[PDB]
A paper describes a structure:
High-resolution structure analysis of F- and FG-repeats revealed that both repeats are composed of two tightly connected triple α-helix bundles, exhibiting an elongated but rather rigid structural organization in solution. Both F- and FG-repeat possess Fn-binding capacity via interactions with type III subdomain FN12, involving residues within the C and F β-sheet.
The C-terminal repetitive region (aa 4511 to 9509), also present in S. aureus homolog Ebh, is composed by a row of 40 repeats consisting of 125 aa. Similar to the F-repeat, the FG-repeat reveals an elongated shape approximately 70 Å in length and 20 Å in width and height. The FG-repeat is characterized by a remarkable strong dipole character. Although the overall amino acid sequence identity with Embp is only 30%, the structural data for the FG-repeat at 1.55-Å resolution reveals high structural homology to EbhA and strict conservation of all major structural key elements. Here, by strong interactions between subsequent FG-repeats, the dipole character of the FG-repeats likely supports the SAXS-deduced, elongated rod-like structure of repetitive FG-repeats.
Numbering used by the authors: 1 to 126
Write the structure that this text describes.
Amino acid sequence: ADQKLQDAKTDAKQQITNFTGLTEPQKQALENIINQQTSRANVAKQLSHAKFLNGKMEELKVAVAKASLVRQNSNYINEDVSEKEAYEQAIAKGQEIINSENNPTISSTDINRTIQEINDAEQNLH
């Protein structure tokens, strides 16, 4: 019923508000997506997507936040400039996503690609 759909949207938006991986712009974009759904099945699909995106954003935030530890404890200080530049480029791309205010991507594949670029570059420093 209409009351069932309204309640499912409210629940989903409340869950999204609790997430810590997603940025506030990402939460707002997803809450808007939730509000536009016409069935509870579709609300659940979008909430499942938000939960997965939240996990990837958690992974991305860790990969970016650990950069100073990596610079200090890996071979970064001794490494060739190409490897150091690749790492800083990848970290900067991750920072761009996290700090974005204008319509941040809600594409988990885009996030996963950025995570993988950081992880690949970090691996070459160990």
